[PDB]
Amino acid sequence: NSNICEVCNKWGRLFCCDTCPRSFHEHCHIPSVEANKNPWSCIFCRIKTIQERCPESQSGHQESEVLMRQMLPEEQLKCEFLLLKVYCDSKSCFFASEPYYNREGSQGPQKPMWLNKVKTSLNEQMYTRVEGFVQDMRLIFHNHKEFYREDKFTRLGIQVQDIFEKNFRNIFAIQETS
Ligand SMILES: [Zn+2]
Ligand SMILES: [Zn+2]
Ligand SMILES: [Zn+2]
């Protein structure tokens, strides 16, 4: 097994996956690493199993159809993994915790959003469709672009949104386009 957390790339109190060499801090894994279960398989292994059990799940899909899916166990897992993939980028630190807004010439967003709030929402099964989760994720970056206007700090929102969108297209097998 790896000697650092797959998500935050630090050592510490790590839980090791039984089916692959990754390790995690307890609350870096999503969902949080389970109390018992031997063997234990991480989210990366669980996602790979879904794909192996249904190879056709990798054929291209339309985003509009994906968004309307109900949050059954397999969609719930895919959204958890997509969230995890965003936390894996070190620039996610800017969007993890609850933001505040006091900048000359700007007004804060009507509906603030941040990654830890999305993490809680997933954990508490508040989203009924994939759409709910994706809308909250995209709102994080949209609020950031709008608030920071022409400051170069806006680019952090562009960068992290690109990681989200690439991972979304991969995990949910969105049909490739020009
Ligand atoms: Zn970690
Ligand atoms: Zn694993
Ligand atoms: Zn099948």
Domain positions in the chain are 1-59, 60-178
Measured from the alpha carbon of residue 59, the closest ligand is 3
How many angstroms does the Cα of residue 131 sit away from the middle of ligand 1? 28
Q: How far apart are CA 85 and CA 65, in angstroms?
A: 22
CA dihedral of residues 45, 47, 52, 53 (deg, nearest 10): 110
Q: How far apart are CA 115 and CA 87, in angstroms?
A: 8
Tokens standing for residue 40: 């234990």
Q: How far apart are CA 146 and CA 68, in angstroms?
A: 27
In this structure, what DSSP letter does residue 91 have? G
Q: Kindly tell me the sign of the dihedral angle through the C-alpha atoms of 123, 128, 133, 136.
A: negative
Q: How far apart are CA 68 and CA 131, in angstroms?
A: 6
How many angstroms does the Cα of residue 101 sit away from the middle of ligand 1? 28
CATH code of the domain made up of 1-59: 3.30.40.10
Q: How far apart are CA 135 and CA 67, in angstroms?
A: 9
Q: Which CATH class is domain 60-178?
A: mainly alpha
How many angstroms does the Cα of residue 176 sit away from the middle of ligand 1? 32
Structure solved via: X-ray
Where do we find the tokens 């899909």? 61
* 37: CB partners within 8 A, 6+ apart: none
Measured from the alpha carbon of residue 51, the closest ligand is 3
Bridge-partner residues for 16, per DSSP?
23
